[PDB]
Design a protein around this ligand. Structure first.
Ligand SMILES: [Mg+2]
Ligand SMILES: [Mg+2]
Length: 746
RNA sequence: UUACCAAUGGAACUC
């Protein structure tokens, strides 16, 4: 029912391939064993002896067995267990009749596609499929790139589709044992610890079997000559096992072993690193070269899928593998109809302007005043000694730009930071703040990529001494040409932090509160995870109430999301004299699995918070946002495939069949191809029309005040993510309650 | 920081 008729139509070409199911039925049977056979493998072989009687075409789970052929008769087959050596009754009885395209059929269809892809000589490294023989060697940075595919049979609304996405995995050419040689040759005191720090948390490939292992430990005491228990019953040396298996000369007796988590031990000689180096990430040149090599234009992606389909077609064995279940792949990718929604109006106080086909307001915001500019009169700039001149320019230009935007700015209070030391930074900032209680902004210039400084400054400002904080690396202000635009963006950010407003969009709905949540899982999960919450407190969706709840093992996060929601509703009651008639919740940071958890556990409890307020039953609309989706769509131009224009919504033929969902591309894509964002509505009590939901979701993407343009997800979710990141990864602490009313996290 | 895009299970084990 999601289909709507707003927006101009367009023809798109997805990275999906339809599968024509040519078989009438796939049946389901249950299996019983008279002497109860606990072992799964033995039951598997037992069914294999009579596989001819049931049929060569089988897919077995242990007690549920799917056959294309109809074994309609409930049958008992006599089998034998070698140890018990007695007759066993395999009783097969049909339990269900299913369509070829049913949901349970999708798993073993995916398994059959696994088999097909294997018969295409493709290597299953991880979940995806890769070909080592097609590797793309890099001679400069010691990198290998493996072309491959990540493919899956799925059932969308239209039917069964093979979603295939091209993927490049970066393997490192040189051995881990060569890295051990490097660290040992460095012969520095106590860098075995640095070697351990490098190895931990980075996945390492075994090329001998093309399997990834996550590094868990390094054993300096253990050696390849050390003993490990075997299935044979005798503990044996790793030398013996590996030499018997492969016979490769283990170069070093001295080399340690990498422990996985019995326990598994790997030689650094026969293991190789995965993932690009962090130094490579910092380097612009290497990253951009690798991106040019990896980045695939829409035409190249379509060509890759066409090549894969042709390769499947030519190999007879793969076609026979798919055909038995009754599946055949069509020759070309699907083509669907999707509509582009009308462009929106951005209303500033003096003027309103319509975005024009680039989806950037950047030039217009600076020229004209914003809605609310909070004057700056008492603020402090803390600057290093060596950077004075650069700092000087920052204020001077900041005055010249300030007029157009509506800010009235006075000269700053200068604080000279005597040296680079962290303790001096903190003490001087605290001294200036204690001396004057009217300091509105703490602006600090930090030198170099000194994140240790930034952490201390933000921790002092956000928690210990509540004051809005702004940090400006000297690198950005140093460049002479770019000073005007940089100053403008800094000035807008200062406007947001002081409590002002930049721009807005016309909101169709009436008495609305757009709650938006996200979760920050730390890179090392062991550390506390965070959930950020941002809710509008004024009707025009320009003022926000931001609160963060930290993950606690003892209490579930719903219990405190309740209190956050109650506080936001009370803030709405006070500021606007009336509670929201409609509350639209955009939930993000939900993996694929927990859509049933959020829909049936979190949301029903979140509604009970309304019980505290007397006889108040607002209308709740809940969306679950996924940005990690694999689907890629392109504009099927008359000429060829082209990058899609902003605002394209697909509500048919790729949406799920148990929810009301849509795929929206709002950001303007400069590079590669456009990857939609998937919105799934788990609760709609408001009976809000599909077109209303799509229009609201598109509108909210225009509100992100850090970027003058449309963004990937609704602004509440991105604000919640910013809050979660700042609270969890930098502060490691809950921010001060007083600062929450403004936008300090930007 | 001027700012958005930019870890474990697989067939009819691995130590
Ligand atoms: Mg987010
Ligand atoms: Mg910021």
């Amino acid at each position: 029912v999601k289909q709507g008729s707003k927006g101009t139509p367009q023809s798109l070409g997805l990275n999906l391939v339809k599968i024509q199911c040519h078989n009438e039925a796939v049946y389901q049977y249950h299996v019983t064993f008279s002497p109860n056979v606990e072992c799964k493998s033995m039951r598997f072989g037992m069914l294999k002896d009579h596989q001819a009687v049931t049929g060569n075409v089988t897919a077995f789970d242990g007690s549920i067995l799917y056959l294309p052929v109809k074994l309609q008769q409930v049958l008992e087959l006599k089998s034998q267990r070698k140890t018990d050596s007695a007759e066993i009754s395999i009783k097969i009885q049909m339990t269900k009749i299913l369509e070829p395209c049913s949901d349970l059929c999708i798993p073993f269809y995916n398994v059959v596609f696994r088999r097909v892809m294997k018969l295409l000589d493709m290597k299953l490294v991880g979940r995806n499929f890769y070909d080592p023989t097609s590797a793309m060697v890099l001679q400069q940075h010691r990198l290998q790139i493996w072309p491959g595919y990540a493919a899956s049979i799925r059932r969308t609304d239209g039917g069964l589709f093979l979603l295939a996405d091209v993927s490049h995995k970066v393997i490192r050419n040189d051995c881990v044992l060569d890295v051990m040689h490097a660290i040992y040759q460095q012969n520095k005191e106590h860098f075995q610890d640095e070697c351990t720090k490098l190895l931990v948390g980075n996945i390492v490939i075994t090329r001998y079997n093309n399997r990834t292992y996550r590094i868990d430990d390094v054993d300096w005491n253990k050696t390849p000559k050390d003993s490990f228990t075997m299935s044979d019953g005798k503990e044996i040396t790793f030398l013996e096992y590996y030499s018997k298996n492969y016979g490769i000369t283990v170069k070093e007796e001295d080399q340690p072993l990498l422990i996985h988590r019995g326990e598994i031990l790997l030689l650094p000689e026969l293991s190789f690193m995965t993932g690009i180096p962090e130094k490579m990430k910092k380097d612009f040149r290497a990253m951009k070269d690798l991106a040019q090599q990896i980045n695939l234009s829409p035409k190249q992606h379509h060509s890759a899928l066409e090549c894969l389909l042709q390769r499947i077609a030519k190999n007879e064995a793969a076609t026979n593998e798919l055909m038995r279940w009754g599946l055949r792949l069509q020759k070309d990718v699907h083509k669907i109809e999707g509509r582009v929604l009308p462009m929106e109006r951005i209303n500033l106080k003096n003027t309103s302007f319509i975005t024009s086909q680039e989806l950037n307001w950047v030039k217009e915001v600076t020229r004209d005043p914003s809605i609310l500019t909070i004057p700056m009169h008492f603020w402090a700039l803390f600057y290093p000694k060596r950077a004075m001149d650069q700092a000087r320019e920052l204020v001077n230009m900041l005055e010249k730009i300030a007029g157009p935007i509506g800010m009235r700015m006075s000269p700053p209070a200068w604080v000279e930071l005597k040296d680079d030391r962290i303790e001096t930074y903190v003490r001087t900032i605290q001294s200036t703040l204690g001396a004057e209680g009217k300091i509105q902004m703490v602006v600090c210039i930090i030198m170099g990529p000194r994140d240790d400084l930034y952490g201390a400054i933000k921790k002092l400002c956000c928690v210990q001494s509540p004051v809005p904080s702004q940090v400006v690396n000297v690198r950005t202000i140093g460049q002479p040409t770019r000073l005007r635009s940089v100053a403008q963006k800094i000035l807008l950010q200062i406007n947001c932090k002081l409590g002002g407003e930049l721009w807005g969009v016309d909101i169709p709905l009436k008495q609305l509160m757009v709650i938006g949540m996200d979760v920050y899982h730390d890179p090392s999960r062991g550390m506390r995870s965070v959930v950020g919450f941002v809710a509008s407190i004024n009707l025009t969706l320009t003022k926000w109430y931001s609160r963060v709840v930290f993950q606690m093992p003892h209490q579930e996060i719903v219990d405190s999301l309740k209190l956050c929601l109650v506080g936001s509703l009370k803030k709405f009651y006070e500021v606007n004299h009336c509670l929201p008639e409609k509350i639209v919740v955009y939930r993000d940071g939900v993996s694929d699995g927990q859509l049933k958890t959020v829909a049936n556990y979190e949301i029903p409890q979140l509604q009970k918070c309304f019980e505290a307020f007397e006889n108040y039953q607002p209308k709740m609309v809940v969306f679950v946002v996924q940005k990690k989706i694999s689907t890629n769509l392109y504009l099927a131009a008359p000429q060829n495939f082209v990058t899609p224009t902003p605002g394209t919504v697909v509500d048919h033929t790729i949406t799920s069949c148990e929810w009301v969902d849509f795929y929206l591309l709002a950001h303007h894509v400069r590079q590669g191809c456009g990857i939609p964002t998937h919105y799934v509505c788990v609760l709609n009590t408001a009976n809000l029309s599909p077109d209303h939901m799509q229009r609201l979701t598109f509108k909210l993407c225009h509100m992100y005040w850090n970027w003058p343009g449309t963004i990937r997800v609704p602004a509440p979710c991105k604000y919640a993510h910013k809050l979660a990141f700042l609270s969890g990864h930098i502060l490691h602490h809950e921010p001060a309650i007083q600062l929450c009313e403004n936008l300090f996290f930007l």
